[PDB]
Write a sequence for this structure.
RNA sequence: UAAUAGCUUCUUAGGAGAAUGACGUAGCAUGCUACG
RNA sequence: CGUAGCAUGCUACGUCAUUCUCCUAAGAAGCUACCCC
């Protein structure tokens, strides 16, 4: 009968139940298991068919979120789980079981009935937040609704899920905070209940209902009491991105950890929170067996800096934000008191102290003078307090007495070229080539409206058992090159007449500081940064250049004290990346002389069913997490295995994080604190961006390979690859270089890549991405959602199913297959509205004369030559327009020189710039 | 190079050759003097090449020593400028409250982010609209950073002084926002 | 072909206004910048001309800046 | 190149051409060959420096031209930009731009940015009765190719004056310039 | 008014290579004078 | 027939002048990627 069974499931507990499903039959539900056994492995959405489910209704016959799972299995498992439960009965964090044998048809089937679970479990929340798909997210909307995070109309908004268009979604996610945190606490109870009862078992995410209880004892072996061990390696690790997405540790800022009570008033002078970090770690992540040093200066290697830094990135969201930044100290120079920084307090790397503190100095050499002028200790200490309400970022001081509002003037108009263009039939109504790239102007509040975009950077706790394998795969990607510290005389500077940041720009360009410092005290500074931390002020400038849309473009000018040492540290690797051809990171490979065709042929590195793909990171340089930037700086500093020691590498990392990651930004006469994200003006910006891009691609591949079912995988080599990938991720702590090589070979075989710092072209296998054995666009959207805190809409990431058309867009240059000589080659052509926009609008009044600038239109015609092969005629006419304009320019130039003097130029070789052959030779593979 | 004796030898060889030609000298004498002229010319050309090389090297050395002198004359100038900047900011320090909080520290180290917050005597509040002005610093005294601040000046985005009576809800559109209000610690 | 003439005449007009030191008056410069950016980012010709009129009336408002009587006399 | 060195080389070349035309043998012909060759070497030496000078006097024509033209271009930027602006504004041939431009010539300039939204305020000075008669018909005010409803007319002393007083007989008694405050209709 | 990369044009300096010519020393062929 | 000397022609080494080519360094100007669509 279907009613006596329902009366038995209620048991002694007086509960009113409605049967989900029908007629004492199993209820089949699609859940989010974290499973690992002999055949299947991974964190994937399975379909469970062994649990009869009843829903409890309270008085007034309303349905509440409390279920009675009556999972049925064999008798041996029933008795084993009964004994394990009777060992763990007295624990508070164990769901109330009820073991009973019921006469189903002709035999006594033994059922175990868990009482007052929830509909979903912690794995469902973790999966729906880590594998987000805006088309199909019904286990996240239902979780948000049923726990009063939102009122079920919040989803009628156009973009509720977006982090950049709708920041209020964060306020929704934080409403799950105290529901996650209690769960963590329940684990620290349950682990103890195992430890004191001698039960060895694996704590999986799919066994904890969202209340916090634990209800699965199937795979628990009992040992002598008091000596058990709970394996929480794969429980806390998958939960880690949720502990900062939902801000599960906000209730630690309040006294007695109660959300109703007011905030804890920490001491303003308190900067050493080591004891508090250890207390938090020992309260929440108690059985996380790996050692945790709150200060990363005690870390064993570059894989323990990532682990402890990732932990501190969570534990630093409960501490006041005024206790971070530099740690100043009053020193004396020839009897006069300076206040200078003798360390730093990184949110990620903890407290770092300088080792060369010169108390009671006598003279200040140029190195010490440069150091004391660079750091913001004197600048912030001698400035007046600032309260800027235009931004949410912390504001330190105002150096001047008034705030400076900087504008961007409009660009000059080249009327001669525009009249010539409209004379040749351009710019008609309905023409396919139209002016779209203009010189936009900005008002006074632009410089501080753009810096406010750093509100998109949130403290993100990355999954640490997976990041420590993505690091290995990325380092395998970066194995071809070589690097190390170089002497001061080997440093090459491309352009010396550019500004040296703040405050050094008030006395000269970078040439002054590269000529005033001899090589001895230029190596002394670099050897100082290897044992000390130099905070640095970086200025924000507004760029004055042609653009498609009106939003301001700020660029960070970093001080010469930072660049002068970063070039020395990184330039060997930076010149080895920019001199290797045929690699994944295509930096330093020209698009001229048949270099684009070689790029596109090295992308197609013998993949089976090629489909091209490209993705765009929304707010790439402003929403990049601190952990991924530290990851990039550690992968880029792995080449220093012989030139410098471990402490030197750590202090170089601390200097990079103090001068790039979390710095003091001078934004219009005011020092603000940059929350994070890479600055676009340091030495290692494009290459660190490339490392981060490859990290995101490998993370998407790992997620796509794990989240596949495991029984649908027909290729028996890929199933074993998944089953070993899960082991090398969570069930393995040391590096397994054989499998790292195997997975890197798999990625090169099926996910061939081409990277320019965020411009990625992928030539993935279509069959595997269809089966899910390789990352697709939805996987990158999910990875960017749970790991970058941005939403990558599918309207800006493209996919090309035909290889005879090339990538749709790479480095803002479209690609087309054109016939040259007797063979077909790929030629890149720019946006044809960009060349006209550069011709018509110039950023200097002397660039409007025309006759003075014939070597300016030659370069534009060189960049716009491939348009001649384009099938559209209005595209092809842009090159002939520039050729005829160069001819007219030279004609009137010779006229003006024949007027100004009485003799023409004798040796004149401008007769080849209006010929198509000089530009056709620019895209020929000979040179 | 003309002062060298090689030029004199070349000139006297040419003069002897010309005198022999004008005097109707024999073939042997003419050819011998021509060969003497040749050996003088080769040595004079070598001397000229040596002089050109020496002069180009001396001029390059002068350029090198007139560039290093400028480098060492700018190094001292930027050093003096940096020392002046580091000492003016020192003379701007409030050595009463800063000294008190630093001596109050356990190890002497205090975070930089709280050096102004407890010692700065001047506060510059930048306000984008009237609602923020009403919320944070309405009136002539407001409380920020656990201290009482008194308004001393209000300027607009145009760096024009604005009287505190002009900042009203109806007069808000006629003001050039943002407003920078400068207050002093009390 | 008169749609793309407005997108350039507004550029020249904002250059003129910037050379007339309207950049110092922040309230007026914000309106001039917004009008210029809305003229450039305009697909419809009527909207571009309607905003061009408002951008030009900033130039005509200042009496002593330009000599409109002389400049238009060259026609 | 027809320089005196080339003249000597040319007469030597003509002598050697005559010798070749004879061209029997042998020692006098070799002597003519050596004399022609040394003359050619002297001419080439004294013409290479002339070519160098001709090349170096083309890096002082271009450098002077793209400096005089540069300073001329960046010196007349305040007036050339305005002339270009008004040339383009004549070229557009719009109805509203030409209307406000032709009104600004007579002195009928607006005191604020002309608003776009309906029922928005525009304060425009009208400095004479002649310009008032054309723009203002009844209570309607034609400006920027749009019709506006007049709210308040204030004379130069800021004293309000009703539209009944503004007439040809009583106009000289008023304190021009009037300021009309209209709302877009 | 930033980092890195690529490309175009011009100038200077240095090095290397090739060609032509002038000249100076070594080796080969031919003719003339003196001696054996 | 040999030796010494002179003269003429042909090869090898060195100096200088001219032309051309290539590279390495330095300097100056410009364009693009960058930023946004
Ligand atoms: C790595 C981890 C701890 C290492 C240790 O220190 N052991 C010490 C001795 C424990 N005892 C055997 C006594 C080992 C020790 C024994 C465990 C496994 C058992 O197969 C039973 C069970 C089989 C299922 O299919 C999958 C789950 C189980 C729980 C396994 C997972 C994991 O692998 C465990 C925790
Ligand atoms: C032997 C066993 C498996 C190998 C290891 C793995 C994780 C270890 C526990 C936690 O790390 C720290 C915790 C706090 C104190 O540090 C000492 C006691 C605790 C309970 C540890 C006991 C024991 O050592 C455990 C179970
Ligand atoms: C040699 C060359 C051409 C020789 C010629 O053919 N003359 C004959 C006259 C030409 N016709 C048609 C009037 C007859 C002459 C003609 C014009 C001369 C330049 C400018 O003036 C002045 C300028 C500034 C300084 O002064 C020195 C440099 C400059 C660049 C001069 C160099 C040189 O000296 C030029 C090119
Ligand atoms: N084919 C099967 N049929 C019924 N029960 C099974 C089967 N395979 C495994 N089980 C039992 O189910 C457990 C895994 O299911 P799980 O997802 O943990 O459910 P729950 O979380 O409700 O315990 C194992 O401990 C095992 O005893
Ligand atoms: Mg389970
Ligand atoms: Zn560590
Ligand atoms: Zn090193």
């Amino acid at each position: 009968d279907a009613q006596s069974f329902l009366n038995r499931v209620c048991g002694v507990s007086a509960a009113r139940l409605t049967p989900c499903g029908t007629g004492t039959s199993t209820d089949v539900v699609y859940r989010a298991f974290d499973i690992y056994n002999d055949k299947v492995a991974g964190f994937a959405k399975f379909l469970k068919t062994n649990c009869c489910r009843f829903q409890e209704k309270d008085e007034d016959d309303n349905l509440i979120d409390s279920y009675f799972v009556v999972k049925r299995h064999t008798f041996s498992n029933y008795q084993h789980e009964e004994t394990i439960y009777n060992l763990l009965k007295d624990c508070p964090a164990v769901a109330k079981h009820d073991f009973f044998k019921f006469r189903i048809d002709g035999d006594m089937v033994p059922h175990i009935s868990r009482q007052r679970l929830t509909k979903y479990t912690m794995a469902d929340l973790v999966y729906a937040l880590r594998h987000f798909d805006e088309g199909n997210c019904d286990t996240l909307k239902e979780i948000l609704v049923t726990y009063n995070c939102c009122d079920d109309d919040y989803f009628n908004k156009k973009d509720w899920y977006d982090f950049v268009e709708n920041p209020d979604i964060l306020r929704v996610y934080a409403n799950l905070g105290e529901r996650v945190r209690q769960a963590l606490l329940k684990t620290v109870q349950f682990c103890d209940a195992m430890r004191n009862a001698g039960i060895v078992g694996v704590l999986t995410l799919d066994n904890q209902d969202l209340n916090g209880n634990w209800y699965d004892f199937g795979d628990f072996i009992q040992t002598t009491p008091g000596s058990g061990v709970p394996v929480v390696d794969s429980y806390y690790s998958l939960l880690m991105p949720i502990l900062t997405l939902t801000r599960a540790l906000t209730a630690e800022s309040h006294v007695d950890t109660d959300l109703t009570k007011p905030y804890i008033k920490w001491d303003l002078l308190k900067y050493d929170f080591t004891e508090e970090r250890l207390k938090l770690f020992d309260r929440y992540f108690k059985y996380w067996d790996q050692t945790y040093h709150p200060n990363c200066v005690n870390c064993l290697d570059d894989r323990c800096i990532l682990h402890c830094a990732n932990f501190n990135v969570l534990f630093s969201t409960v501490f006041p934000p005024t206790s971070f930044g530099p740690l100043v100290r009053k020193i004396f120079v020839d009897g006069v008191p300076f206040v200078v920084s003798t360390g730093y307090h990184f949110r990620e790397l903890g407290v770092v102290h300088n080792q060369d503190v010169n108390l009671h100095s006598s003279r200040l050499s140029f190195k010490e003078l440069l150091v004391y002028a660079a750091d913001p200790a004197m600048h912030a200490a001698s400035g007046n307090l600032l309260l800027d309400k235009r931004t949410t970022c912390f504001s330190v001081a105002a150096l001047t007495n008034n705030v400076a509002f900087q504008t961007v003037k409009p660009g000059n108009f080249n009327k001669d070229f525009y009249d010539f263009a409209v004379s040749k039939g351009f710019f008609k109504e309905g023409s396919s080539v139209e002016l779209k790239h203009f010189f936009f102007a900005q008002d006074g509040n632009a410089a501080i409206s753009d810096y406010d975009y750093y509100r998109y950077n949130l403290p993100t706790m990355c999954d640490i058992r997976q990041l420590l394998f993505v690091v290995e795969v990325v380092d395998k990607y970066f194995d071809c090159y070589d690097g190390g510290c170089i002497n001061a005389n080997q440093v090459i500077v491309n352009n010396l007449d550019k500004s040296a940041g703040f405050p050094f720009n008030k006395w000269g360009k970078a040439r002054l500081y590269y000529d005033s410092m001899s090589y001895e005290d230029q190596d002394a500074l670099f050897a100082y940064t290897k044992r000390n931390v130099i905070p640095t002020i970086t200025q924000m400038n507004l760029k004055y250049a042609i653009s498609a849309k009106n939003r301001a473009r700020t660029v960070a000018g970093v001080s010469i004290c930072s660049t002068m040492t970063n070039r020395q540290f990184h330039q060997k690797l930076l010149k080895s990346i920019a001199a290797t051809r045929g690699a994944t990171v295509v930096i330093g490979t020209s698009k001229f002389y048949g270099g684009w065709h070689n790029m596109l042929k090295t992308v197609y590195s013998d993949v089976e069913n090629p489909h091209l793909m490209g993705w765009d990171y929304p707010k790439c340089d402003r929403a990049m997490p601190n952990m991924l930037r530290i990851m990039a700086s550690l992968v880029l500093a792995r080449k220093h295995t012989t030139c410098c020691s471990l402490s030197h590498r750590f202090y170089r990392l601390a200097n990079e994080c103090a001068q790039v990651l979390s710095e003091m930004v001078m934004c219009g006469g005011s020092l603000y604190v940059k929350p994070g994200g890479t600055s676009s003006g340091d030495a290692t910006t494009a290459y660190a961006n490339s490392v981060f891009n490859i990290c995101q691609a490998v993370t998407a591949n790992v997620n796509a390979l794990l989240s596949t079912d495991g029984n649908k995988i027909a290729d028996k080599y890929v199933r074993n690859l998944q089953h070993r990938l899960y082991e090398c991720l969570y069930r393995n702590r040391d590096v397994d270089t054989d499998f790292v090589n195997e997975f890197y070979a798999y990625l090169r075989k099926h996910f061939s890549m081409m990277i320019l710092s965020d411009d990625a072209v992928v030539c993935f296998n279509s069959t595997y991405a269809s089966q899910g054995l390789v990352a697709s666009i939805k996987n990158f959207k999910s990875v960017l959602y749970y790991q970058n805190n941005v939403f990558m809409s599918e309207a800006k990431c493209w996919t090309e199913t035909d290889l005879t058309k090339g990538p749709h867009e790479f480095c803002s240059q479209h690609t087309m297959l054109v016939k040259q000589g007797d063979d077909y080659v790929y030629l890149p052509y720019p946006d044809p509205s960009r060349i006209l926009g550069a011709g018509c609008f110039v950023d200097d009044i002397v660039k409007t004369d025309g006759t003075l600038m014939i070597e300016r239109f030659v370069s534009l015609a060189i960049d716009a030559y491939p348009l001649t092969k384009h099938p559209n005629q209005e595209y092809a006419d842009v090159f002939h327009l520039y050729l005829q304009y160069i001819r007219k320019l030279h004609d009137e130039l010779t006229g003006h020189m024949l007027d100004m003097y009485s003799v023409m130029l004798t040796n004149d070789n401008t007769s080849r710039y209006w010929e198509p052959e000089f530009y056709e030779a620019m895209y020929t593979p000979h040179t | 190079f003309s002062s060298l004796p090689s030029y004199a030898a070349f000139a006297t060889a040419q003069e002897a050759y010309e005198q022999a030609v004008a005097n109707g000298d024999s073939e042997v004498v003419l050819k011998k003097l021509k060969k003497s002229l040749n050996v003088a010319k080769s040595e004079f050309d070598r001397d000229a090449a040596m002089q050109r090389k020496l002069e180009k090297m001396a001029d390059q050395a002068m350029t090198q020593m007139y560039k290093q002198a400028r480098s060492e004359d700018k190094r001292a100038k930027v050093t003096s400028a940096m020392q002046t900047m580091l000492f003016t900011m020192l003379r701007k320090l409030d050595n009463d409250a800063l000294n008190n909080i630093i001596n109050n520290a356990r190890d002497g180290c205090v975070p930089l982010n709280i050096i102004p917050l407890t010692t700065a005597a001047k506060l510059m509040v930048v306000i984008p609209d009237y609602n923020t002005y009403k919320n944070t610093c309405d009136g002539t005294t407001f409380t920020y950073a656990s201290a009482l601040w008194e308004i001393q000046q209000v300027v607009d985005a145009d760096s024009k002084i604005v009287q505190l009576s002009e900042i009203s809800m109806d007069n808000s559109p006629n003001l050039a926002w943002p407003l920078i209000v400068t207050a002093l610690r009390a | 072909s008169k749609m793309s003439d407005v997108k350039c005449t507004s550029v020249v007009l904002l250059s003129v206004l910037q050379q007339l030191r309207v950049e110092s008056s922040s309230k007026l410069w914000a309106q001039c910048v917004q009008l210029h950016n809305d003229i450039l980012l305009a697909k419809d010709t009527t909207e571009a001309f309607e905003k061009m009129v408002s951008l030009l009336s900033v130039l005509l408002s200042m009496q002593g800046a330009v000599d409109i009587n002389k400049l238009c006399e060259e026609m």
Notes: The pocket of adenosine-5'-diphosphate (ligand 4) is lined by residues A 33, 48, 50-51, 69, 71, 73, 77, 206-207, 216, 218-219 (CB under 6 Å).
